[PDB]
Amino acid sequence: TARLLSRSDWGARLPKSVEHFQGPAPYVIIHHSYMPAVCYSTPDCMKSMRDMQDFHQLERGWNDIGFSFGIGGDGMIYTGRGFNVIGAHAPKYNDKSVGIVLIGDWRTELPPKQMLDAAKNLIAFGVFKGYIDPAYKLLGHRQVRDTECPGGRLFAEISSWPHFTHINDTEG
Ligand code: NA
Ligand SMILES: [Zn+2]
């Protein structure tokens, strides 16, 4: 069922400015939104994308929604900054990652399968198109900053995905 929806599809405001990075992204960073909560209908998930964009641009002074892509509980994928655009989601990785937010609070609940499938399909499509390195490393936000994101339950889930790794597997 899953589709990639454009920025115009969810009624996004324009970015203030767009900065690019070059070549395939060597990292994929997974997030949860926490608030907004899980969205089951496409109207609610489009509103949730606008709510995050509004928080980021109009409360935090950012150029755009900080994420590359969002995933709704409708099983749809929502274009954020998109591929090869510098994000504002993961310090030290914003110019070398795809930042994917699974809308909701995933501290204790597992996202519904359609969200997990959509995230994996987005990554697979990014590798197919050459936007994501075929040897990408998969991380949760909590591995690169002092945060709970993407929630303990979703963290345990992504720990079972292909390409998951720990930064401290390499010494030095
Ligand atoms: Na920004
Ligand atoms: Zn995060």
Residue numbers in the entry: 12 to 183
Q: Can you quote the paper on this entry?
A:
Drosophila PGRP-LB belongs to the amidase PGRPs and downregulates the immune deficiency (IMD) pathway by cleaving meso-2,6-diaminopimelic (meso-DAP or DAP)-type PGN. The structure of the PGRP domain comprises three α-helices and one central β-sheet composed of six β-strands, similar to the bacteriophage T7 lysozyme, a zinc-dependent amidase. The main difference between amidase and non-catalytic PGRPs is the presence of Zn2+ in only amidase PGRPs, which is coordinated by two histidines and one cysteine. We generated mutants to characterize the amidase reaction mechanism and solved the X-ray structures of wild-type Drosophila PGRP-LBPA/PC and its mutants in apo form or complexed to TCT.
To tackle these two scenarios, we designed and analyzed four different mutations of the conserved residues in the catalytic Drosophila PRGP-LBPA/PC: H42A, Y78F, H152A and C160S. Only the Y78F mutation caused complete loss of the enzymatic activity for every compounds. The introduced mutations did not affect the ability to recognize PGN, attesting that Y78 is the only residue taking part in the amidase mechanism. Initial X-ray and enzymatic analyses showed that the Y78F mutation does not destabilize the protein structure and prevents PGN substrate from being degraded. Y78F and C160S PGRP-LBPA/PC mutant structures were elucidated to 1.30 Å and 1.40 Å resolution, respectively. Both mutants Y78F and C160S PGRP-LBPA/PC share a similar fold with PGRP-LBPA/PC wild type with a RMSD on Cα of 0.49 Å and 1.12 Å, respectively, but in different space groups, P6122 for PGRP-LBPA/PC_Y78F and P1 for PGRP-LBPA/PC_C160S. PGRP-LBPA/PC_Y78F also presents a crystal packing artefact where E182 from the C-terminal of a symmetry-related molecule makes a coordination with Zn2+. By comparing the apo and complexed PGRP-LBPA/PC_Y78F structures, the C-terminal symmetry-related molecule is filling the binding pocket of the peptide moiety from the PGN attesting the non-physiological nature of this interaction. We showed that Zn2+ is totally absent in PGRP-LBPA/PC_C160S mutant as already observed in the structure resolution, while it is still present in PGRP-LBPA/PC_Y78A mutant and PGRP-LBPA/PC wild type. Regarding PGRP-LBPA/PC_Y78F, the amidase activity is also abolished without Zn2+ in the buffer.
